[PDB]
């Protein structure tokens, strides 16, 4: 059904596909990323996505309370998901703040990243059109680093709080506040524009990318796997957790979304179409990103792995460079950053609404007493703004990288996806879950879903976790910056805040229940009505 796609496809795709996947793929050397990416997509991604929507429809209890009807012991999965959402909402909006700053900087006769006659540029700047004719730096890269970001020399040096970036964060949070409070969302005739425009802009950037002199050398780097050397655990964890991040699984937002749907519909085809569409747009936009990078390699006369940032700044370096190469660059820069703001804001609205309704159910006697709901929304937005304010400082990039690596990705998604699949397959029961799916949608999942939940997803999550611990290498920003041990510990604390929820809730519910230990366990394993 055309409408069934059009309504939700443009909101399910978000900044993950356009921004995180290109930067993670570039960080891991291009073609080697795609092998563990497609292994996780079909081994785990589509099966765990189908699993979470089924839980949502089956329980109709939201992202947290759903586990009471499946396995009371593992209710901590809901709290882990809700704190993953809480951490994601703090850092994800910083990308919209950067996009907003870029959009206001676009209102010029000449784009500021197109040249470096400007005051913020180092004497090492050389225009890319002349560079190939040393330690030279590109005007776009040091624009990113010094005007927008003001990159401090380390996380130990927070520096000054950037007032412009703080006001951009305030602007986006005000927009989120009013849209969530008033319930504004694309449902009128504007949905067609909101869905079509991102794909149109992506296709325009694709055609600009593929036609630039060097696009083929960038598409070689993007598709040729380094199978003989690249199989470190970092590429396995990155590629695996990118699938879980892009599908918004392990967040409990999928269960919440499914809780508002009637359990009498063909879930399977809709989930398989939405997931294959999302992974398709990610993979396709990869061609544009890497053909822009491969053109930059041929213009500047350096290797494709050295043209740009092995980090979040990849998109803010590549796409501005692309729109610099187009007729009337101001128009395309403005359109690109409006597209980015729309695509990020829709996802942010979904995630904040999911967080709000998840947290309201934990105290409806005070969190839902009429306008107390608006008060709670304002409190959540203010707290998230004050938390994001730490990343507006000159050293905010390192905090942002730590948050992206640890707080809502990596081992925590592997942990949540492993416990979901393990509980449903083994503790609750694969036969029970398949019978329930029969009752709802009319047919059993079949062997692929059954064995993906029973073996493949647990084996992939445990293999990636153990390989990460056995062959541990620490996080870095870009290619060379090394985090201090205290910042690594902070990132691991961010991750453990989500991970520890399951053991903590297990021991709490064991404490809360009377009777002998085995009777407690039997009581807390059996579902409630």
């Amino acid at each position, epitope marked *: 059904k055309i409408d069934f796609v059009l309504s939700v496809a443009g909101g399910f795709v978000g900044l993950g596909n356009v921004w995180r996947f290109p930067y993670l793929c570039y960080k891991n050397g291009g073609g080697a990323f795609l092998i563990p990416y497609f292994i996780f997509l079909f081994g785990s991604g589509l099966p765990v996505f189908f699993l979470e929507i089924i839980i949502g429809q089956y329980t109709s209890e939201g992202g947290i309370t759903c586990w009471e009807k499946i396995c009371p012991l593992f209710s901590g999965i809901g709290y882990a998901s809700v704190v993953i959402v809480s951490l994601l909402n703090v850092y994800y909006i910083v990308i919209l703040a950067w996009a907003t700053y870029y959009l206001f900087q676009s209102f010029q006769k000449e784009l500021p990243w197109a040249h470096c006659n400007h005051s913020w540029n180092t004497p090492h700047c050389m225009e890319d059109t002349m560079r190939k004719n040393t330690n030279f730096t590109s005007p776009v890269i040091e624009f990113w680093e010094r005007n927008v970001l003001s990159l401090s020399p380390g996380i130990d040096h927070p520096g000054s709080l950037k007032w412009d970036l703080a006001l951009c964060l305030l602007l986006v949070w005000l927009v989120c506040f009013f849209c969530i409070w008033k319930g504004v969302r694309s449902t009128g005739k504007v949905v067609y524009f909101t869905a079509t425009f991102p794909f149109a802009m992506l296709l325009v950037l694709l055609v600009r990318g593929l036609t630039l002199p060097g696009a083929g050398a960038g598409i070689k780097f993007y598709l040729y796997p380094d199978i003989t050397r690249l199989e470190d655990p970092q590429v396995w964890i990155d590629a695996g957790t990118q699938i879980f991040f892009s599908y918004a699984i392990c967040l409990g937002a999928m269960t919440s979304l499914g809780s508002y749907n009637k359990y*009498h519909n*063909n879930v399977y085809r809709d989930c398989m179409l939405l997931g294959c569409l999302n992974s398709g747009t990610s993979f396709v936009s990869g061609f544009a990103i890497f053909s822009i990078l491969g053109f930059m390699a041929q213009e500047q006369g350096v290797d494709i792995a050295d043209v740009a940032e092995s980090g979040p700044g990849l998109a803010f370096i590549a796409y501005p460079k692309a729109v610099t190469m187009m007729p009337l660059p101001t128009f395309w820069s403005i359109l690109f950053f409006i597209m980015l703001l729309l695509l990020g804001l829709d996802s942010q609205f979904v995630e904040v609404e999911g967080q709000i309704t998840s947290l309201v159910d934990l105290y409806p006697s005070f969190l839902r007493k009429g306008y107390r709901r608006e008060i709670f929304i304002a409190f959540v937005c203010s707290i998230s703004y004050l938390l994001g304010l730490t990343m507006v400082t000159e050293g905010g990039m390192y905090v942002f990288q730590l948050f992206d690596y640890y707080a809502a990705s990596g081992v925590c998604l592997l942990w949540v996806a492993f416990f979901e699949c393990f509980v449903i397959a083994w503790i609750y029961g694969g*036969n*029970r879950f398949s*019978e329930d799916i*029969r*009752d709802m949608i*009319g*047919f*059993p999942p079949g062997p692929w879903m059954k064995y993906s939940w029973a073996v493949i997803t647990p084996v992939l999550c445990v293999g990636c976790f153990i390989f990460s611990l056995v062959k541990y290498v620490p996080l870095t920003y870009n290619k060379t910056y090394v985090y201090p041990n205290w910042a690594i510990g902070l990132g691991w604390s961010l991750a453990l805040s989500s991970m520890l929820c399951v053991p903590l809730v297990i021991v709490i519910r064991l404490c809360q229940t009377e009777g002998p230990f085995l009777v407690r366990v039997k009581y807390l394993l059996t579902p409630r009505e």
Partner: antibody
Amino acid sequence: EVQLVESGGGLVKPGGSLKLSCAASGFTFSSYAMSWVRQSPEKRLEWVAEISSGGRYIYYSDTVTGRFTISRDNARNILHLEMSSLRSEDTAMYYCARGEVRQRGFDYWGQGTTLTVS
Amino acid sequence: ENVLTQSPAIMSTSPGEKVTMTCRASSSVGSSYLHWYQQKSGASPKLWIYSTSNLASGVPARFSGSGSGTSYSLTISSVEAEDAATYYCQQFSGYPLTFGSGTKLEM
């Protein structure tokens, strides 16, 4: 997926009770939902009851909802139907049908047993 | 209960002629949840068409099915002696399950 064989049909007085049986073979009976379908002497097909593959979900038609009790023995691959109070209108031939996929329907039908009340 | 009705209660037909049998529903039935069954005289019914077009394992290709919403039909390109049987439409979209009144080919 080969064979189904009903048993237990016969003659009982109105208001009596009877228990039908349906044996299964050639497939994993525990993995398939089973249903009873009823054909009146007027040849009209009427659905009676459905039991899920694990027996957790059970449905009845409104005309038998209070009087009939479907059950299954996954360990023996035999399906059962229990009737408490047979009215005059219940006389018919009963077929057990394999109905695991609602989008595909009743793949296989047993030979059936005639039930008479008078 | 979604009552299903079939119009041509009896069809005396000469061999080789095309035949179409209509099925009508009191309520909207999903296309995936309507099926057709054949029943030869003196034998148990057998699945014939499912999901409104998908022919069963043993049904000859001469049979076909079409429909949507509250109207459904089964067609035969050319009837024959082997096709003389009673055909029932059935909805699987919601309980209680209901079968159509059934139509018998008479020649």
